[PDB]
Enzyme design. Structure first.
Site, PDB file in Angstrom:
ATOM      1  N   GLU A 210      18.108  -6.027   5.324  1.00 37.11           N
ATOM      2  CA  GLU A 210      18.711  -7.286   4.920  1.00 37.11           C
ATOM      3  C   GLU A 210      17.859  -7.841   3.792  1.00 37.11           C
ATOM      4  OE1 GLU A 210      19.322 -11.860   6.527  1.00 37.11           O
ATOM      5  OE2 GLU A 210      18.920 -10.261   8.001  1.00 37.11           O
ATOM      6  N   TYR A 211      18.514  -8.395   2.790  1.00 41.14           N
ATOM      7  CA  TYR A 211      17.828  -8.985   1.640  1.00 41.14           C
ATOM      8  C   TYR A 211      17.824 -10.495   1.796  1.00 41.14           C
ATOM      9  CZ  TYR A 211      18.189 -11.350  -2.899  1.00 41.14           C
ATOM     10  OH  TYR A 211      18.173 -12.268  -3.917  1.00 41.14           O
ATOM     11  N   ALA A 212      16.680 -11.097   1.498  1.00 43.52           N
ATOM     12  CA  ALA A 212      16.447 -12.517   1.763  1.00 43.52           C
ATOM     13  C   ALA A 212      16.219 -13.268   0.476  1.00 43.52           C
ATOM     14  CB  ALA A 212      15.259 -12.693   2.677  1.00 43.52           C
TER      15      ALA A 212
ATOM     16  N   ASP B 111       1.752  -9.980  14.315  1.00 47.71           N
ATOM     17  CA  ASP B 111       1.452 -10.209  12.874  1.00 47.71           C
ATOM     18  C   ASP B 111       2.443 -11.088  12.110  1.00 47.71           C
ATOM     19  OD1 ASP B 111      -0.320  -9.957  10.684  1.00 47.71           O
ATOM     20  OD2 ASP B 111       0.976  -8.423   9.799  1.00 47.71           O
TER      21      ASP B 111
ATOM     22  N   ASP C 233       9.043  -7.272   9.014  1.00 45.31           N
ATOM     23  CA  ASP C 233       7.954  -6.394   9.417  1.00 45.31           C
ATOM     24  C   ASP C 233       7.631  -6.392  10.896  1.00 45.31           C
ATOM     25  OD1 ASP C 233       5.669  -5.549   6.886  1.00 45.31           O
ATOM     26  OD2 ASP C 233       5.856  -4.516   8.840  1.00 45.31           O
TER      27      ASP C 233
ATOM     28  N   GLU D 280       3.005 -14.317   4.510  1.00 50.41           N
ATOM     29  CA  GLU D 280       3.408 -13.138   3.733  1.00 50.41           C
ATOM     30  C   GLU D 280       4.591 -12.424   4.394  1.00 50.41           C
ATOM     31  OE1 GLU D 280       0.219 -10.423   2.931  1.00 50.41           O
ATOM     32  OE2 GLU D 280      -1.233 -11.989   2.357  1.00 50.41           O
TER      33      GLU D 280
ATOM     34  N   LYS E 184      13.242  -0.775   1.108  1.00 45.65           N
ATOM     35  CA  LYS E 184      11.805  -0.550   1.243  1.00 45.65           C
ATOM     36  C   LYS E 184      11.617   0.937   1.019  1.00 45.65           C
ATOM     37  CE  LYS E 184       8.501  -3.401   3.658  1.00 45.65           C
ATOM     38  NZ  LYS E 184       8.332  -4.477   4.699  1.00 45.65           N
TER      39      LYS E 184
ATOM     40  N   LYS F  61       0.801  -1.251   0.000  1.00 47.30           N
ATOM     41  CA  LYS F  61       0.000   0.000   0.000  1.00 47.30           C
ATOM     42  C   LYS F  61       0.827   1.291   0.000  1.00 47.30           C
ATOM     43  CE  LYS F  61      -4.113   2.247   2.276  1.00 47.30           C
ATOM     44  NZ  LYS F  61      -3.643   2.843   3.572  1.00 47.30           N
TER      45      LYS F  61
HETATM   46  O1  LIG Z   1      10.641  -6.085   2.305  1.00 48.22           O
HETATM   47  C1  LIG Z   1      10.208  -6.969   1.605  1.00 48.22           C
HETATM   48  N1  LIG Z   1       8.890  -6.959   1.236  1.00 48.22           N
HETATM   49  C2  LIG Z   1       8.205  -7.898   0.409  1.00 48.22           C
HETATM   50  C3  LIG Z   1       7.479  -7.466  -0.688  1.00 48.22           C
HETATM   51  C4  LIG Z   1       6.822  -8.375  -1.483  1.00 48.22           C
HETATM   52  C5  LIG Z   1       6.881  -9.712  -1.194  1.00 48.22           C
HETATM   53  C6  LIG Z   1       7.592 -10.151  -0.111  1.00 48.22           C
HETATM   54  C7  LIG Z   1       8.253  -9.255   0.692  1.00 48.22           C
HETATM   55  N2  LIG Z   1      10.973  -7.998   1.151  1.00 48.22           N
HETATM   56  C8  LIG Z   1      12.301  -8.238   1.428  1.00 48.22           C
HETATM   57  C9  LIG Z   1      13.094  -7.709   2.382  1.00 48.22           C
HETATM   58  N3  LIG Z   1      14.306  -8.268   2.236  1.00 48.22           N
HETATM   59  N4  LIG Z   1      14.332  -9.146   1.217  1.00 48.22           N
HETATM   60  C10 LIG Z   1      13.112  -9.123   0.740  1.00 48.22           C
HETATM   61  C11 LIG Z   1      12.808  -9.956  -0.388  1.00 48.22           C
HETATM   62  N5  LIG Z   1      11.789  -9.815  -1.173  1.00 48.22           N
HETATM   63  C12 LIG Z   1      11.851 -10.769  -2.121  1.00 48.22           C
HETATM   64  C13 LIG Z   1      11.014 -11.059  -3.183  1.00 48.22           C
HETATM   65  C14 LIG Z   1      11.296 -12.113  -4.045  1.00 48.22           C
HETATM   66  C15 LIG Z   1      10.375 -12.425  -5.196  1.00 48.22           C
HETATM   67  N6  LIG Z   1       9.433 -13.548  -4.867  1.00 48.22           N
HETATM   68  C16 LIG Z   1       8.436 -13.127  -3.847  1.00 48.22           C
HETATM   69  C17 LIG Z   1       7.496 -14.281  -3.564  1.00 48.22           C
HETATM   70  O2  LIG Z   1       8.212 -15.449  -3.113  1.00 48.22           O
HETATM   71  C18 LIG Z   1       9.176 -15.854  -4.094  1.00 48.22           C
HETATM   72  C19 LIG Z   1      10.168 -14.740  -4.365  1.00 48.22           C
HETATM   73  C20 LIG Z   1      12.444 -12.883  -3.813  1.00 48.22           C
HETATM   74  C21 LIG Z   1      13.278 -12.591  -2.755  1.00 48.22           C
HETATM   75  C22 LIG Z   1      12.985 -11.537  -1.907  1.00 48.22           C
HETATM   76  N7  LIG Z   1      13.559 -10.988  -0.808  1.00 48.22           N
END
Ligand SMILES: O=C(Nc1ccccc1)Nc1c[nH]nc1-c1nc2cc(C[NH+]3CCOCC3)ccc2[nH]1
Length: 252
Positions: A85-87, A130, A148, A134, A36, A17
């Site tokens: 951090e990126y996942a 929460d 989150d 998701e 973000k 949103k």
């Molecule tokens: O902040 C969000 N917010 C957020 C926004 C939308 C969806 C999830 C998280 N995400 C993240 C923070 N750190 N790393 C992430 C992250 N988002 C990813 C998205 C993908 C694409 N796909 C999503 C659905 O599942 C399979 C992968 C891949 C790796 C990621 N790492």
């Protein structure tokens, strides 16, 4: 400290949103992370700026292998930015849609990962409230990472009866959740799913859930224990860790 010209924005990772998250690279470090991106506009519109710099506060002072590191933040004119951090492996949610349902050993592992995670937070007197799929990211190992903290101290599905009814709530909320999560992992949908807010309110309130046949007895055991109407009767994360179906099935 950090500005926007320190980063190279890359593939977008997500919607939502308030804005988007993007993969991004720290220019001088070559460091990979998620940005973000949120608006001073939309923040003050659907007023939440309090909750923000709360999340900023909480997800900052926190450190755990199963909690998404928050590195920092920054705003300009138009907007506020979160350096996450990126996942790699995305959400537990998507893996679920993909697999439509997880096996016991997976479920259990997550549960532990989750328990401990929750444990660290409770230790530091933080309740999340929460913990929906998701909201559950996956690390390179494939390990549960909890994103989150907007509502750390809308869909009801993950809320326990106390919260929903408006009553006194303590850290036991998260055990209800863990129960729900747990049920969802195994069954593919959450135990209290309805088609309306109103039905869900009731279903949750009356703790009305049932198990499909294929749900092993020990599973039922644990979920039932977690999904008690009364906070007090809810296990301790300890017991949850120590549950015989957890420890019989948890690969981690
Ligand atoms: O902040 C969000 N917010 C957020 C926004 C939308 C969806 C999830 C998280 N995400 C993240 C923070 N750190 N790393 C992430 C992250 N988002 C990813 C998205 C993908 C694409 N796909 C999503 C659905 O599942 C399979 C992968 C891949 C790796 C990621 N790492």
């Amino acid at each position: 400290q950090w500005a926007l010209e320190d980063f190279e924005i890359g593939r977008p990772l997500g919607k939502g949103k308030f804005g988007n998250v993007y993969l991004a690279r720290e220019k001088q470090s070559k460091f990979i992370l998620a940005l973000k991106v949120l608006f001073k506009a939309q923040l003050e519109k659907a007023g939440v700026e309090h909750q923000l710099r709360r999340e900023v506060e909480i997800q900052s002072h926190l450190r755990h292998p199963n909690i998404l590191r928050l590195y920092g933040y920054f705003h300009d004119a138009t907007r506020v930015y979160l350096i996450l951090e990126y996942a790699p492996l995305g959400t537990v949610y998507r893996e679920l849609q993909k697999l439509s349902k997880f096996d016991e050993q997976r479920t259990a592992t997550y549960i532990t990962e989750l328990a401990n995670a929750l444990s660290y937070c409770h230790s530091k007197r933080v309740i999340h409230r929460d913990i929906k799929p998701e909201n559950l990211l996956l690390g390179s190992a494939g390990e549960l990472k909890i994103a989150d903290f907007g509502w750390s101290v809308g869909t009801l599905d993950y809320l326990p009866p106390e919260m929903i009814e408006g009553r006194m709530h303590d850290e036991k909320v998260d055990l209800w959740s863990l129960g729900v999560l747990c049920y969802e992992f195994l069954v593919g949908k959450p135990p209290f799913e309805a088609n309306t807010y109103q039905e869900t309110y009731k279903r949750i309130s009356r703790v009305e859930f049932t198990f499909p046949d294929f749900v092993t007895e020990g599973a039922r055991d644990l979920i039932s224990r977690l999904l008690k109407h009364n906070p007090s009767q809810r296990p301790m994360l300890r017991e949850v860790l120590e549950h015989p179906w957890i420890t019989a099935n948890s690969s981690k």
